[PDB]
Amino acid sequence: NHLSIVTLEEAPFVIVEDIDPLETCVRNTVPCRKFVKINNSTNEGMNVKKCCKGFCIDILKKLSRTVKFTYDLYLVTNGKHGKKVNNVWNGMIGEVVYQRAVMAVGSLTINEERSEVVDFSVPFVETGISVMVSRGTQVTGLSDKKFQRPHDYSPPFRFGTVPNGSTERNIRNNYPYMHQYMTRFNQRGVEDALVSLKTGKLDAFIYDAAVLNYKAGRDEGCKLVTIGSGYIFATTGYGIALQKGSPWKRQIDLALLQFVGDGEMEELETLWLTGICH
Ligand SMILES: N[C@@H](CCC(=O)O)C(=O)O
């Protein structure tokens, strides 16, 4: 009963590394494969062996040990965390919905749309929407006038997010103007956004709270500050996604609860998520 499990890279939850040519993953890593295309024309491709580590990987290792299952971990190839595009789910959520994976482990945010098509374990990392700015910049949260009336400033307040995730969904579904203003500043990824902030090319980066709290905690030079958005309606957590009606949610939940109660979760948080910047 080898379980097919999908994941996605997003430090410090999931970190990917090339395997050692001379061909096994060691230390705190585990095997993870990815289907890579031969070219940009056809569907042809081959699965490439890589190695994975991180907070979520350690959670997977513990679940494997405790629930007593073995697994075949693979990386998503189309999309990221999960979005319904042209009426079809992609990313980690898609792999679970279309039964390619029994579970999805990673920095996967629990939200209403996703819960309609997949079942989630209890949350194990708290998150929501946060705002990151250069240390010194003053903002109260997303209700700040700088965000409500960006054009009332010279130059217009510059803020954006990484599209296609739960953060964009929460803005697009409720505040049309803010969303369409923001697309002007879409960021390709977290690292891109951080550079834009520290060099003064971007005023604020709106993104997942867990990741922003982590990044601000160990920024080189501690030049970044993260503050809550105030969008409490968006407060949620990361959860392991399973097939709708999955018979494993019960056992996965019991394990997570066991880890929380025994202090094992506490130890993992200390190992991977602590910060140093005040
Ligand atoms: N963790 C988010 C991705 C990042 C974000 O949109 O804030 C998700 O599962 O969609």
Q: Which DSSP string do the residues of 90-156 spell out, in sequence order?
A: -HHHHHHHTTS-SEE-SS-B--HHHHTTEEE----EEE-EEEEEETT----STTSHHHHSGGGSSSP
* Spacing, Cα 77 to ligand 1 middle (Å): 16
Resolution limit in angstroms? 1.7
Query: Do 184 and 263 share a structural domain?
Result: no
Return the C-alpha torsion angle 42, 46, 51, 57, nearest 10. 70
Domain range for 84 = 1-127+235-273
Closest to 32 (Cα-Cα) out of 3, 74, 62, 92:
74
Ramachandran assignment for 86, one of left (phi > 0), alpha (psi -120 to 50 degrees), beta (any other) = left
Rounded-to-integer distance, Cα 143 and Cα 228, Å: 11
- Distance between Cα 256 and ligand 1 center (Å): 21
Q: Is the CB of 56 under 6 A from ligand 1?
A: no
Number of domains in the chain: 2
Instruction: Please enumerate, by residue number, every residue annotated as part of a binding site.
Output: 107, 109, 114
User: Which residue carries 């998503």 as its tokens?
Assistant: 76
26 occurs within a structural domain: yes
Are 31 and 77 in the same domain? yes
Residues 248 and 102: beta-carbon distance below 8 Å: yes
Breaks (C-N over 2.5 A) in the chain follow: 22
Could you tell me if 156 and 267 lie in one domain? no
Question: What radius of gyration, in Å, describes the C-alpha atoms of the chain?
Answer: 19
Residue nearest to atom 6 of ligand 1 (CA): 165
Q: Taking the alpha carbons of 38, 95, 92, 23 in that order, is the dihedral positive or negative?
A: negative
Torsion of CA 20, 26, 27, 31, to 10 degrees: 100
DSSP codes, 242-262: EETT-TTHHHHHHHHHHHHHH
Best CA proximity match to 81, nearest among 118, 131, 122: 118
Nearest to 203, CA basis, from 154, 249, 168, 237: 154
Method: X-ray
Residues whose CB falls within 8 Å of the CB of residue 267, separated by 6 or more in sequence, listed in order:
none
228 and 252 housed in the same domain: no
Distances (CA, A) of 74 to 54, 212, 224: 15, 25, 33
> Do 7 and 120 fall into the same domain?
yes
Cβ burial of 68 (10 Å; 0-12, 13-18, 19+) is exposed
Dist. CA 23 → ligand 1 center (Å): 32
Does residue 83 form part of some domain? Answer: yes
247 burial type by CB count under 10 A (0-12 exposed, 13-18 middle, 19+ buried): exposed
Domain contains 278: no
Residue linked to tokens 């980690």: 92
184 domain-assigned:
yes
CATH number at residue 24: 3.40.190.10
Alpha-carbon span 180 to 189, nearest angstrom: 19
Using CA atoms, how far apart are residues 176 and 60, in angstroms rounded to an integer? 38
User: Is the shortest distance between the CB of 185 and ligand 1 below 6 Å?
Assistant: no
Asked if residue 108 has its Cβ within 6 Å of ligand 1, the reply is yes
